Amino acid sequence: ATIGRISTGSKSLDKLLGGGIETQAITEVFGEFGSGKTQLAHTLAVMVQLPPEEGGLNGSAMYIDTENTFRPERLREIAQNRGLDPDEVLDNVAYARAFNSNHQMLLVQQAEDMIKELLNTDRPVKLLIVDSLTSHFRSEYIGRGALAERQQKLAKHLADLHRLANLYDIAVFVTNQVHILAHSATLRVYLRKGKGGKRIARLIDAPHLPEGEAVFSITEKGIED
Numbered sequence: 001a002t003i004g005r006i007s008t009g010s011k012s013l014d015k016l017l018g019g020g021i022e023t024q025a026i027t028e029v030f031g032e033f034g035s036g037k038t039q040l041a042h043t044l045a046v047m048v049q050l051p052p053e054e055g056g057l058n059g060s061a062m063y064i065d066t067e068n069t070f071r072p073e074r075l076r077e078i079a080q081n082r083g084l085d086p087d088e089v090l091d092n093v094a095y096a097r098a099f100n101s102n103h104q105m106l107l108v109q110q111a112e113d114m115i116k117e118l119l120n121t122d123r124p125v126k127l128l129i130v131d132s133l134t135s136h137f138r139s140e141y142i143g144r145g146a147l148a149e150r151q152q153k154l155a156k157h158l159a160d161l162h163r164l165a166n167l168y169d170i171a172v173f174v175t176n177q178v179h180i181l182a183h184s185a186t187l188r189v190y191l192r193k194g195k196g197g198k199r200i201a202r203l204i205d206a207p208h209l210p211e212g213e214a215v216f217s218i219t220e221k222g223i224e225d
């Protein structure tokens with residue numbers, strides 16, 4: 001099945017990504033607080049709803065929040081400033097708070113129910129966001145021997161997410177706070193602050209995409225160049 005691409009709002013970042021965030025893939029962004037990772041998540045939750053000539057997939061979004069980062073009024077602002085109705089856009093982002101890592105796993109199973117329900121409608125789910133994907137796992141699995149257990153549980157969670165991406169042709173977008181641990185996202189992107197309020201993006205361990213860094217801004221439209 002054809003891979004779909006969701007624009008980030010930034011031509012620069014889209015170019016680095018090969019056209020946008022991909023369906024049938026998990027894209028992980030990681031960086032410090034304020035590096036742009038959560039702003040990008042909010043922007044994508046709007047962009048996915050646009051028709052494809054505007055960089056979207058005529059879809060809806062689901063957002064799993066682990067550390068209370070979701071801001072409905074930020075979605076509304078981004079929508080309004082892109083010419084969209086803020087309430088309709090907000091209504092197309094299904095939201096759930098994950099209370100702990102086990103609940104987070106259950107939420108992925110519930111996400112599948114909604115994805116199945118909407119799959120063949122005029123507005124299928126096309127984006128699943130997990131913000132700070134590792135936060136509960138790092139809180140709960142800690143101490144002697146916790147590395148193997150935590151990594152096994154994360155690997156399983158990520159396998160579940162890969163399955164949804166592949167089976168239902170959706171983009172999975174995950175964020176993490178910031179060197180020898182294994183990772184299993186399809187594509188990893190490091191974000192950092194740069195000069196002039198810009199953020200800088202770099203692909204990590206991706207020899208299949210060309211060399212470079214993207215530069216973008218955080219604005220009233222979410223993310224843009």
Ligand SMILES: O=C(O)C1Cc2ccccc2C1
Pocket residue numbers: 062063064094095096107108110111114
């Ligand atoms: O069906 C629901 O009400 C909730 C299930 C779920 C799972 C992940 C993200 C959002 C939501 C919404």
Ligand SMILES: [Ca+2]
Pocket residue numbers: 033034035036037038039040
């Ligand atoms: Ca951010």
Ligand code: NA
Pocket residue numbers: 024025026162165166186
């Ligand atoms: Na995949």
Ligand code: NA
Pocket residue numbers: 088091092
């Ligand atoms: Na709707």
